[PDB]
Amino acid sequence: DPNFFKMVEGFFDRGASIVEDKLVEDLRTRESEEQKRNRVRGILRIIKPCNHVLSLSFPIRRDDGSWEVIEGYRAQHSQHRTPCKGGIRYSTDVSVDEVKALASLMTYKCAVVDVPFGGAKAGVKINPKNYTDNELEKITRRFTMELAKKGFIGPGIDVPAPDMSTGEREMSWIADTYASTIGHYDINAHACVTGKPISQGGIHGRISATGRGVFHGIENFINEASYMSILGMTPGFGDKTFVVQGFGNVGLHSMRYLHRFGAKCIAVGESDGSIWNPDGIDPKELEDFKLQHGSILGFPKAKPYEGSILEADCDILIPAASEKQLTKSNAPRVKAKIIAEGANGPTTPEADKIFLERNIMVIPDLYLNAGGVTVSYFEWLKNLNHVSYGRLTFKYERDSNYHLLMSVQESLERKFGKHGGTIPIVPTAEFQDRISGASEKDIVHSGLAYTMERSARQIMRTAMKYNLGLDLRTAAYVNAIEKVFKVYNEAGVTFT
Amino acid sequence: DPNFFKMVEGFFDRGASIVEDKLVEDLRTRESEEQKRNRVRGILRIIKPCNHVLSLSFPIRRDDGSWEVIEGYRAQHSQHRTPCKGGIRYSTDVSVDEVKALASLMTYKCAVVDVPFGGAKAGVKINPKNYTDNELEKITRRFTMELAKKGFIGPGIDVPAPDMSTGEREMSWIADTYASTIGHYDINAHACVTGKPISQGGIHGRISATGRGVFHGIENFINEASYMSILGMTPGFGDKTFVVQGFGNVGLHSMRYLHRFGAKCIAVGESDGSIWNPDGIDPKELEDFKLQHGSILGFPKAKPYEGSILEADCDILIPAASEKQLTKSNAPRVKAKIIAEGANGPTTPEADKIFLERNIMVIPDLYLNAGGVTVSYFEWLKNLNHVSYGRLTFKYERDSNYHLLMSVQESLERKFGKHGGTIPIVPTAEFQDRISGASEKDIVHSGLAYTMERSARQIMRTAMKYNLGLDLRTAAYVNAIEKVFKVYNEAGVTFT
Amino acid sequence: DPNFFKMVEGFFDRGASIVEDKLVEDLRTRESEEQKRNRVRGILRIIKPCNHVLSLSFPIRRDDGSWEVIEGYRAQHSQHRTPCKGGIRYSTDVSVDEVKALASLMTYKCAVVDVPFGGAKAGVKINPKNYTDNELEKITRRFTMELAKKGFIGPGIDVPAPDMSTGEREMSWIADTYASTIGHYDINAHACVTGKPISQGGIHGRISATGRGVFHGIENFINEASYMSILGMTPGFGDKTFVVQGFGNVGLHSMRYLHRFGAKCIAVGESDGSIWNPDGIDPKELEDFKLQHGSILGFPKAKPYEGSILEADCDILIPAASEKQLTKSNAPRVKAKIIAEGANGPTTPEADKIFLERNIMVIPDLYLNAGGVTVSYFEWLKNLNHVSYGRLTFKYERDSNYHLLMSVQESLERKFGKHGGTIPIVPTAEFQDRISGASEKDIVHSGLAYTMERSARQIMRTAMKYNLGLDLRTAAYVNAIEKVFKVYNEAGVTFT
The missing domain is CATH 3.40.50.10860 (Leucine Dehydrogenase, chain A, domain 1)
Known part of the structure; x- marks a missing residue:
């Protein structure tokens, strides 16, 4: 097995190169002065080394x-x-x-x-x-x-x-x-x-941050036809079944939202044994168990599944634990069509090739667990703002919402000798909860969702840009390298 | 009569203690290491003295x-x-x-x-x-x-x-x-x-700030069943009648909003005489009078009520003037079931006991007139932001509102050979005014309302938390002490 | 007995007034515009209160x-x-x-x-x-x-x-x-x-600082004819005899230098008993005793003198201990003609009058123990300089001194067929020690001496300026008030 240093170094180089040609050409070679644009790629060499x-x-x-x-x-x-x-x-x-x-x-x-x-x-x-x-x-x-x-x-x-x-x-x-x-x-x-x-000065919506990131990351791709086609996903009977290796904040929360949206948690994993149940393990229960006492070990309604959950048959497998679990060794024996890296670096560069070869789609750690960074950016912003999100608008909003509804009502009652008969004014219970539970986490999670999505779309667009396949990972680093290069590009070095 | 120094010192101590036990126990004694949690209460002693x-x-x-x-x-x-x-x-x-x-x-x-x-x-x-x-x-x-x-x-x-x-x-x-x-x-x-x-660099919605605070403070409790039960309030005939002692910004504005919401201002007070009228004194008029010439003295439609308005029979009495007006002396002769302290410190510690004993609910100065501080927090924020609230969104919002309505219209007209027949697009006049008068004060007052309410609910929750009765005041200081202690608690002193 | 607050307040006022008239008149009334110079004395009122x-x-x-x-x-x-x-x-x-x-x-x-x-x-x-x-x-x-x-x-x-x-x-x-x-x-x-x-970053010459200050303070006045005349001092048989009340750093060191310069330490004092010996107590010994074991109590060669050393018959009495020791009570029974306040505030305002009346000269705490402040000013300076005094010059100086001497030698030998016969080149042993022991304390003590002297002369000049007698104390505060007023005077307030 390699070390992150080399792995990431590699990940970087690989994209740096892919980027090079394109980046220079149609993108900036437009004005190929001295055609020494290949020399201006010195940006990439400045970019690579930790400053x-x-x-x-x-x-x-x-x-x-x-x-x-x-x-x-x-x-x-x-x-x-x-x-x-x-x-x-x-x-x-x-x-x-x-x-x-x-x-x-x-x-x-x-x-x-x-x-x-x-x-x-x-x-x-x-x-x-x-x-x-x-x-x-x-x-x-x-x-x-x-x-x-x-x-x-x-x-x-x-x-x-x-x-x-x-x-x-x-x-x-x-x-x-x-x-x-x-x-x-x-x-x-x-x-x-x-x-x-x-x-x-903390921000609300922090703990679950990383989990929702995993959730939204998988979502954006799992609702993507083209992607799910190549995998034969979005199944009529297969549908949604996930196995979560590792039951910590991220693994816990991933299990929660994946589930909350109609996914069947067939088997959960830990450091000790594992668990299984094709009928579905409930997030809350398993949560309370792991809290009420040590490990999930011996979860009632859970047959001690023995073997690597990695081998388990499910659609989506989320390694929300230990570094490099998916290796060339077990890679070829995995059953899932989607590997959502909840953990940082759970699959080796070799295993990637294998999965790639056998069309297992691996959603990159780089993108998938960046939900925490996303919320930290929001904390920092919260810290600069000197106010909690929604502190000054929740009420203003509640008021306007009610005005919208009352306008629908009034307009509709003008189409009858009505005065209190057509009642739109009544918001759905769901909207009623939302209204009565307006708080920061709301705004935070919205921002998270908006970023995870807008980014998923970006990663997808680059895959195609760079004609990468279900090689989401290198599409990701490329997406990044392009961005970092752009900031320097519209500056330089000292002649920046 | 005592001095604020002692009064507040007392108010503090009283809650500090109530807080102590609870705060230590179920709250943090969970991990009672050396059980020297009673020693970590040193926080409170650091808290008390002005630094x-x-x-x-x-x-x-x-x-x-x-x-x-x-x-x-x-x-x-x-x-x-x-x-x-x-x-x-x-x-x-x-x-x-x-x-x-x-x-x-x-x-x-x-x-x-x-x-x-x-x-x-x-x-x-x-x-x-x-x-x-x-x-x-x-x-x-x-x-x-x-x-x-x-x-x-x-x-x-x-x-x-x-x-x-x-x-x-x-x-x-x-x-x-x-x-x-x-x-x-x-x-x-x-x-x-x-x-x-x-x-x-001032903020709009400042002047009335303190008055609306009083208004919303009283509101939150006055719409609270449980509270109004203990007082026999939310009456079928008694309803809403208030007597405002003191006719300055706060007393003026309190009289305005209390009234604007269906309260009868029976008698207003000043430094000279008083006024009376069971049929109701109109805020605007009394306002213009006090402006057109000196005191409210001799307000047409106002019988010079003589005696302390404090004695007046009404549901809610708001001392929006002079320190400690309600004393052990007149306390037992007051007729109001609610004493909303618009002024800072209008009732002595003794009078509190009396009221408490005879179930007169006194809404604490600490909470009731904190509306001004609330808006100042907003000014400071406005100053940091370098922009007025709603400067960039009012129009964006107007647009979306219109889209919502036009969507209701279009969807509804698709249930007929309609094309301009069902007109929801028309907002209620009220919503029309709101739309055409979008400005900072709007956002400001919203934030005020949101804070006054979310806090009222907090004060209520602590009353119960600490099983205090209609002893809103000590419930308040406790609410505060808990908060202040928490910030230190998740830090310390130097080992902070 | 009064409190420093009042004492100093008084000391201040007394001089403030003495200064007023003179300060305004011949000094600045030269251009008596509106003669509102008496109004510009507002400086003094700004000066008095601790800012x-x-x-x-x-x-x-x-x-x-x-x-x-x-x-x-x-x-x-x-x-x-x-x-x-x-x-x-x-x-x-x-x-x-x-x-x-x-x-x-x-x-x-x-x-x-x-x-x-x-x-x-x-x-x-x-x-x-x-x-x-x-x-x-x-x-x-x-x-x-x-x-x-x-x-x-x-x-x-x-x-x-x-x-x-x-x-x-x-x-x-x-x-x-x-x-x-x-x-x-x-x-x-x-x-x-x-x-x-x-x-x-400390400075050498610090500890003894306060003692030498006392020494030099007494010196400057004790070598002053006029002063010693009014006291009948600079005696043929009386000569120099001092009694030091208090045996701490200052009392210790005062006893040392006073002695080193031909003064007889007849009796030393402490918190317990006292000591006596008309033949003279040696500073070093008494020092080593007080170090080798507790108090000076039972100093061999020391008859336990009992009574207040303040009463002791000597020329100069130095209260290098406890606040207000010399009071109206014992003031009239003191035998010394000079009271050198080594301690801060050892004589009450009343006792001053008595001494004044009976021509006992009291050298003010304000001036006499300012030697420590003096050396602190030097430390601060050393700190800013980022070097020890004499670090770069001692050697340069040694060289030039030797050149001076060798020039005397050479010039003198040119008045003979000499070549190594007249030897001035040889510095006195004393100068030889100085040369071989050049170090900071040297420079420090020089500065101290230079300040104590230049200031003594100033205090004297003001005594006369303000026709004060052996009222050195008010001459002192006046000297100060004048100075402080001058800095403001050549500025103002805001129109400073």
Whole structure:
């Protein structure tokens, strides 16, 4: 198996090239001055390498009065779009190369869903398990101060975020330290990081963010005829059946919305055993089980399905867990026609070829799980705005809606000696709930849906542009590379 | 009678305690590590004391070439939420304790209506009457410079506002001085203060702001069954009758909207005599009278009601004037079942008990007159946005509304050989006015309504949460204390 | 006994008036336009009141996981001269009035010795004894952050310093916190406070600073004929005999230099008993004793002198301890002709009159112990310079000195068939030590001496200017008031 560094490096190169010819030709060779347009492709070579990478060593006084000196890293791949956005990982295996790689992905991931940020990513070579929360707060804050002093953390410079290793606690600590030290004068000091609790400037619609992204990503393609044709999908009996490997936030939430929209969750997966049931596993129940006690293991109404759920027969298989699960090994034995990468990097470059060869459509991690980045862009915006979405309009809207309905009523009653007989004024219960439950998550999820869709359409349009097939992944990176190149293109370097 | 310092100090303590137990238990004792959660209640002790208080002495050269050295104060209760928001009072009785007290109230008042600001408050020990406008401008600007230099006036630090003693002139002077000196480089320099004239960045819907707040506050409770049951309200004959003590902006405007919605204004009050009329005093008229000449005294269609209107028999009595009017003295002789505190602090802690005992529902100053703070939050926002609300959408909306209606028409005419026969396209006159008069105040008032309501529901939910009765006041402060504690809770102190 | 507030307030007023007439007349009434020069004395009224006073309340988490919320204050009397300079006191009795008062003194004290700073002073209502060093570091740093955020601690704004309650630890903590948070970008961040250890940017010659000040202060007057005439001093047998009440840094060091210059230390004092010996107590010994074990109590070669050393018969009595020791009570029974106030405020306003009446010359605290402020001005300077005094010149100088001597030699040998016979080249041992021990303290002490002297001469010149007698104290405050008035005078207020 390869390493993200090489995988992404490859993903990049592959598209960089595909892009090269087209990009130069019909696109800009129009005015082929000296035909040295092939030389102006120097943009791509500037684009590829993660621009700046900071490596720290800083101490914290462990609770037992002793001194430990922690080491961490933070790379900012591109500032072609201002606040570099990216997570912070606390794990003993984080490496400049890991960070260097992921930071790259992030710029491409952001471009795909049109999020105005450069990619960045951090790692503090630490094992949270080995530390008291007090020591964790100390590490995060000291880490922040350093990040802040060398230009790797401000609101308009770099805006970190959690990673499976970190969370809203760490995010709150960071925001706080920045806003009380280095960012004291900044009116948007609290925008220095996203992923914070609601009480500290967080945005509603955050947790489910990543899941809905998976949901909407799969949706946009699954309602696409052409795509579903090549797969023989949109079946009369096959219909909708999904197997979710991994039952965390994303896997959990994916199972929820996929289901809420008429999909049958036949089998769910974990780190221990698996589960099965052709009749359908209910999201809520399985959720409450996993909450009421440890794993989903022994879920009543669940036959302990044994074998890799990856092998399971279903239409859509969502690896919402562990890196590279789909490999050349099991790739040829998979039964699903759609591989929606809920997890970051669950299929190896080889497995891709196999799937490609046997027409298994794999919806790319780059696009599929970019829903979280999408909502973070919204938090940052929330932080800059200094107000929650819909705070000033919900009521205004409620009023106008009612006016529309009352106008239908009044106009219709003018076609009778009516005065209270035709009652449109009454909104559907569904609209009634919506009305009575107007809140941020609403606006947030709308934006998410709008981005996931507008982007799906873009990725599709490029597949064709670049005549790629069900090779959504390279269509994606290409879509991104084109975008990143464009910003530079309408500038340059220093003669930018 | 007590002093706000003690009153508010008390109000605070009372809730702080009620909150303590609950807050710790089911809420966070879940993970009672060392059960030293009772120690983490140190948050409350940090919360109580007004954080910083600045006291100045600065000179101005009185018009007669002489030098006077004015003294003033500004306290910032909490920065747990960034721009401390709060007024500036010019009166010879302003005191560090007064300011210290009011600044506290402000943080709680803001939390109640979910306005993201810490409480702050100022006082310049001066009597405006004794000074020429030129001297007032000099005092306000010099005051501002000082405030600015010690961190008590920036847009992202502290944003002052008027107080009965000060107004949009002073507000304009301030904004101006800050924006031309200390705030020269600030793109939001004009957000340093709210309450400014429209031509200087003010917001429309400001004046009536406080009145509508009173209106909506009373409304939310008056349409609440359960509440009105305990009072025997929502009467078949009693219905709606209010007596407004005090006829200033707030009292004026309260009388207007209460009335506009079917309430009978039986008697209005002033500093001189009073007025009466069981048949109903019209807001507009009484308004024009008070404008055309001095007091409402001798209002035609008004029998000079003599006695304290507080004693008057009506359903709702709104003290929109002088501090502590309802005391243990007259408390037991009041006839109203609802005491809507339009004024800040019109009922003493004792009178509260009496009312409580005899089921008179008193809607708290903390919540009831927070409508002004609400609109100031909107001004500040308008200032940051650099645009008036609805500037870019009114037309877009007008268009879509018309499309909705034209779609109803077209769809309905497809159920006939119709082509211009069924006319829904015609909006109700009411909707027609709304359409033709789209402007900021609209959006502003909507936001106000949305906040007053969402908060009323919150206050109600906590009353029950804490099993308080028609003790809306302590339910309020509790609601606030909970909020303020939460922000700290998801942070700390230094280990914040 | 009165309180510094009133005492200093008085000291101020007294001189303010003396100054008024003269200051206006021959000095500026030259061009008596409208003769409203008496109105331009508004300067004095602006001068008197401590300009700004900040009062905090901030928490620290006491070592036992609990939360305490500490309260402190910092007043800046005048910014007529930029960095307000002033100490920080940790004691449960610090009060806005105390701070307000002392901050005033500081501006006058600084003016006297021509130190370009406004007076400021702080107090953290805390008892160091009740806290662990870790808690003290927390309090000092948090205190600093607050001070920093409201404009009461930067290098070019306000530069705190120790007070008997605080010291170089606290000073280091402060400098450090400022330089790592709020002052991160400041190249002179470390100049935010004086009194720091040498390793953190401190200056050499600091500890003894206050003592030498006392020494030089007494000296300048004691070598003054006219003064010593009125006292019958500069005696043939009486000569030099001093009694030092209080044996701390200042009392210790005063005893040292007074002695080193031919003064007989007859009796030293403490908090317990006293000591006596007409033959002379040796500074070093008494020093080592007080170090080797507790108090000076039972000093071999010391008869436990019992009674107030204040009553002791000696020429010069230095109260280098406790506030107001010399009162109307014992004033008339004192035997010394010179009262050199090593301590801040050791004689009451009444006692002054008595001494005045009986020609006891009291050298004012304002001037006499300003030696420490003097050296702090030098630390701050050292901090701005980014180099130690004499670092670049000592060697250059050594060289030139040797050239001077070698030129004397060579020139003298040209008046003989000499070549190595006349040897001036040889510097006196004393000059040899000086040469071989060249270091900062040298330059520091020189500056101290130069200031103490140039100021003594100034104070003397004003005594006469204002025809004051051996009323050095009011001559001092007058000297200061004149200075402070001049800076404003060549500016104004806003029309400054």
